[PDB]
Symmetry: D2
Subunit: 310 residues, 4 copies
C-alpha cells in the first residue's frame, strides 16, 4: 500500500542513504574490543516490504551483534508463548526517567531497559537448560529472518560477561527484590542474557525480522506465522515509546515509528503494514544511537510521510 | 474507511455505552463546588466520523467544562500560529515521571501538564489584551467545533482562580526560571489559563473538535481547514503519550489512541482518519480519569481493533 | 574556660584574620543592587566571649543585612514562645538533599531552608499586625545583641520583595499543602519574611547575638535571660547540621561548630560555653558561603581545637 | 567530670533500665535464623567511664553480633592507618536522603551506610590475605575492648553471605563505578565485610570499645593509645550524623550523642570525655533501631543533660 512504485521508492532510499553518509560524527562503542574493532565508515541500510520486495545499499552483509536490538525480539517471543498477562506480572509497560531501579510495583519499568530484558530472559522456555533455551530462540529468530543470516559471536559473549559488572549488579538487585520466577538461577539467566546480546545478523536478515513485525507477525518471505498478533502489537507499542534509550521521547515525537537501537550501531525500524528496516553504522551519539541511523530515520519520515500521525 | 457500515457500528457503540454504564465506581471531583455539583450518573458518548456522520447516546447535551481537555487544543493553536520550533523553545516534547519541576533544559516536560499548559498559554496571541486573546481562542474552538456548542463558565473560572494556589506556585516558579517570553504578565497569563479551563462544551460539540484532529485538521462538518497538518501531528503525538495523567503509559499500551482526559470527567478521544469522540462521566478514578470513560475506551479498542498497532 | 589568656587568644585571631584576608576569590551576590553595591574587600571579624570580653578586627562596624543569618534567630524566638512540640508540627528537624519540596510529612525539612523559615515566620506573634510583629522581633534582637546595633534596610526589603519570585512560589506551594496555621495571610507572612531578611547588624552587634546562644541563652553583656534553654539547644543542633547551605555536611565534619551563613557574606558562628562570632566578607563561593569566612573558620578550629569532637 | 558521684549515677541508670524494660514493642530481625533465634526479652546496658568505672544491668554477658555497630569501628581503623585524606578519596562525609546510589562524586555518601562500609573495608590492610586482614582487625578490637570479650559467629557469617543479594548488588555496582582501590578483589572484600559483621561482643566488652572512643582514643581500662585523635574525631562526627539509619536526624536533634545501631539490636553510644555505652535488645522498630535502646537513650539525655548542646 501507499508506495506505490517500489522502483522509485528505492531511488529515494539510496538518496537518503547518500545524505546520511556525509554525517561522520559520533563515537564507536569501545567498552569491549569486539565493538571498538569496527570501522566508523561502515554504513548499510536494508529494506524488506510486507510483500517481500527487498533493497540494500552499503555494507548490508557485514555481520554485527544485535545487542539491545534483540530486546524487543525476545520480548515478542515471551508474550507469544506466555501471553500479555503473565509476562507483565514481571515487567512494566512504560518509559521511565533517565538509573538502576524498579517502579512503584518493584518491577523493571519496561522490556527495553536492561533490568527488564534480564527479567524477560528469565521467562523464556523455563525449565530446560541454557543450551536448549539458546537453541529455541535461535529457532525463532531464524523464522523471523526467513532463514537468512543469524549467527553468534563468542568473542562478544565472553567480553560481555567478563565486563558486565553493572548487569551483574542489576542481577543481584532483581534477585533481592524477588523479580524472577520461583527457582530461577540468576547467574544462569545473565549468561543467557549475554548470549542473546551476542547473536549476529546483517542489515539484510535483520530487515526481514523487522518486516515480520511490520507484517502482523508473518514473515514476508515465507508467509509463515511466527509471532501472535498480541505479541506483535505489544512489541511495537514498547518500541514506539522505549526503543531509543533516552532519545525515545524525541524520536517518538519527530519520527513516530516503532524502533530499537543497539550499541553495535544498529537501528531496527518498523513501518507497520509497509516495511521493515535495519540501519547500521557503528558511530553512536551521546544518547547511544547510531548517528547516521538517526539522521536517516528523520529524513525518511520527512520525505515519505511515514510518521505515526501524518 | 474500515467501518464500513456506520449503522451497525453505531449499534456496537450503544452496546459499549450500556456496558460502561454499569460501572458506578469513582469519585466526582470536588475541589470546587462547580465540579461537586455534578451527578455521578451523567454519562454521554458522542461520535463524529471523518465524513460528518454523527451519533450520540446518553447525556450528550449537558454542558461541562473542558478543563485539561483544552490543553491539546490550545497547544494545537500555538503550533498552528507559531510553528513547532518556536513553541518548543518553551516546552518539552515528552512524558515525565509522576511533581512540580522542569526538565534538564529548565522547560516544562510537555504541553499536557499544568506547567506546560501555562507556558503554552503565554505564547498565544501575544501583545493583545486578555479579552482579545480569549476571543481569539473562542473563534478557533468554534471553527474546530463546526460552530456547535462552545460556552463559558464564569462560576468555574472564579472558583478556579480563587483556589488555584498550586497553579500560582507554578506560575511564580516558571517566572523565576525565566520560562515565559520577554515581557510576560505572569498573573495575567494564569488568569487567561483559568478562563480557558472554564470553556464549556457538550459531548456533541467536543466530538466534532476531536473529529477535526482526526481529519488532518479539517472540520468534518464544514470542510474548513482549521489547524495546520504540523499542528495536528504534534498534538496527536503528545496526546498519545501524555494525555491521561499518570495513566498515559498504560493507556498507550492497552488502548493506543490519542486522548486527553479532564477533571470534569471528559475524555477527548481520537481515531486518526476515522473519527473523533467525547466520553463524559464525572466520577473519576485514583488517576483522575473518568471511570466509565476508561472502561468504554478499553472496550472500543478490544472490539473494533482501533489500537495504533493492531 | 579553656582560653585561658584572652590577650594571647586575640593575637591568634588577628593572625587568622590576616591569613584569610589574602583569600580574594569569590563573587559578591548581585541578584539585587543592595548586595552588588558591596566591596569584595570588606572583611571583619568580631568576637564576644561568654564573659563579655570583646575584640574586633577589620570592617566590624559597617552595617550589612542578616539575610539567612536571621533564620536561626527567629527559629529560636518561636521555640522560646511556643516550645519544641508546637513549632515542629509545622517544620522538620533535619537536613535534606540538595530543591523546592517537603518531607514525607508534607513539612519543610528544617528551619534553615527558605520554606521552613517562611513557615517559622508564620508562627511568631500570631494575631497582631505586621508592624507589631516586626517590632516584637526587633525587641528580641536588641536583647540578644545587648542593645548594640540593630537596624533595617528598606532598600533591601523593597528589592527582596519585588524580585522574590521563588519565595512567592514557595509561599503559594506551602499554602496549597496546608503548611501554615489556620487563617494565615500568606502574602502578609512573605512580607514579614522579607523584612526580617532586611534587618541590619554589624559584626560587633552580631557577635553578641551569637555569644548569647553560646551562653545558654543569656546575653553576656547584660546578663539577661533572652532565650529559653530549650530554644538555644534546638537552634544550635539545627545550625550544626543545616546552617551552611549545601556545605553543611562538610562544615560539620571539618569544623564541627554551630553556624549560619547568609548571602550578604556573613557567618554567625558559635562555640558553646566559650564565645560568639560574626565573620563578614561579601565574596561568596559556589556554595553561597563567604570565602574569607569559611577559610577563617577552618583555621580557627585547626588552631584552638574547638571542633565539637576534639 | 560532671558526674560527680558514680554511685548515685548508677542508681539512675538502673532506673532508666527498668523504665525501658516495660517497652515491649518491636520486632526481632529475622532475615536470617541467627537473628530470629533471639528472645525479645533480652535487655542489657553496660557503662564504662573515661576512668574505668564499670556498671552493668540485665543481659550484659550474652554474646551478640556487632553487625552495623562495627562500621564506625573499621572506619576508625582505616583513618588511623591511612589518614582522613586518603580514606575520603573513596567515601563521603555526610548523610544522604532515605536507596542504592553514590553522591555527585560517585562515592558512597558516608562510612555508615552499606556501600560506604564495603568501600572502607577494601582500604584496610591492603595486600595481605583475608585471614591476615581479619586477624589484624580482631587485634584492633581487642585493644579497643581492653581485651574483653571479642568473638566470632560462623553461623551468622555463612547466613549473611548466602543471603546478601543486596550487598552483592552494591558490590558489583561499586566495582562498575570504579569505587575500589586498584586491583581489588571485590568478592573477597564482601567476604571480609560479612565476617566483620559477624564479630561478637557483649554489652560489657562493647561499652569499653565505646569508652575508648569517648576517651580520645585511649582504652580506659589499660591506658593504651588505640586510635589516633583524628580517627576518633572523624568517627564521632559521622556517628553523630549517620549512625541511626533513617532515625539519625531525629536522634541528633533529641539526643545529640554519637551513636551507632545494629540489626542485632545493639546501640553503641558515646558521651565524649565521659563514658562509653552499649545498649542491647533484639526487638527493632520500623527504623531498624532497638526499641528499648532508643527509649533508654532519650531518657538518659533528658535526665543527665548529656545532649551535645545542653
Ligand atoms: N545495546 C546495548 O546497549 C546493550 C549493551 C550491553 N550488552 C548491555 O546489555 O548492557
Ligand atoms: N483537568 C484538570 O486536571 C485541570 C484542573 C485545574 N483546572 C488545573 O488547571 O489544575
Ligand atoms: N541569605 C540568603 O540566602 C537569603 C536570600 C534571600 N533573601 C531569600 O530569602 O531567598
Ligand atoms: N546492622 C545492619 O543493619 C547490617 C545488616 C547486614 N549484615 C548488612 O550488612 O546489610
Amino acid at each position: 500500500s501507499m508506495i506505490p512504485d517500489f522502483m522509485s521508492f528505492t531511488s529515494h532510499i539510496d538518496e537518503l542513504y547518500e545524505s546520511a553518509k556525509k554525517q561522520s560524527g559520533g563515537k564507536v562503542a569501545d567498552y569491549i574490543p569486539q565493538l571498538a574493532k569496527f570501522s566508523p565508515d561502515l554504513w548499510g541500510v536494508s529494506v524488506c516490504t510486507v510483500d517481500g520486495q527487498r533493497h540494500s545499499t552499503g555494507d548490508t552483509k557485514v555481520p554485527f551483534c544485535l545487542q539491545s536490538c534483540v530486546k524487543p525480539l525476545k520480548y515478542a517471543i515471551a508474550v507469544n508463548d506466555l501471553g500479555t498477562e503473565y509476562v507483565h506480572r514481571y515487567v512494566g509497560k512504560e518509559p521511565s526517567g533517565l538509573k538502576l531501579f524498579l517502579n512503584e510495583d518493584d518491577k523493571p519499568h519496561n522490556p527495553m531497559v536492561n533490568a527488564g530484558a534480564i527479567v524477560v530472559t528469565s521467562l523464556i522456555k523455563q525449565g530446560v537448560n541454557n543450551a536448549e533455551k539458546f537453541d529455541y530462540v535461535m529457532q525463532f529468530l531464524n523464522k523471523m529472518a526467513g532463514n537468512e543470516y543469524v549467527g553468534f559471536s563468542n568473542a562478544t559473549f565472553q567480553s560481555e560477561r567478563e565486563s558486565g559488572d553493572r548487569n551483574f549488579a542489576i542481577g543481584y538487585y532483581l534477585k533481592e527484590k524477588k523479580c524472577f520466577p520461583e527457582g530461577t538461577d540468576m547467574v544462569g539467566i545473565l549468561d543467557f542474557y549475554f548470549q542473546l546480546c551476542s547473536i549476529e545478523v546483517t542489515c539484510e536478515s535483520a530487515s526481514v525480522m523487522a518486516a515480520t513485525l511490520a507484517n502482523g507477525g508473518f514473515c514476508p518471505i515465507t508467509g509463515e506465522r511466527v509471532l501472535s498478533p498480541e505479541a506483535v502489537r505489544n512489541t511495537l507499542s514498547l518500541m514506539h515509546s522505549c526503543g531509543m534509550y533516552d532519545f525515545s521521547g524525541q524520536f517518538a515525537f519527530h519520527v513516530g515509528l516503532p524502533a530499537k537501537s543497539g550499541v553495535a550501531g544498529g537501528i531496527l525500524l518498523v513501518v507497520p503494514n509497509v516495511m521493515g528496516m535495519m540501519c547500521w553504522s557503528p558511530p553512536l551519539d551521546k544518547m547511544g544511537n547510531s548517528v547516521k541511523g538517526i539522521h536517516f530515520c528523520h529524513d525518511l519520515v520527512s520525505l515519505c510521510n511515514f510518521h505515526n500521525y501524518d
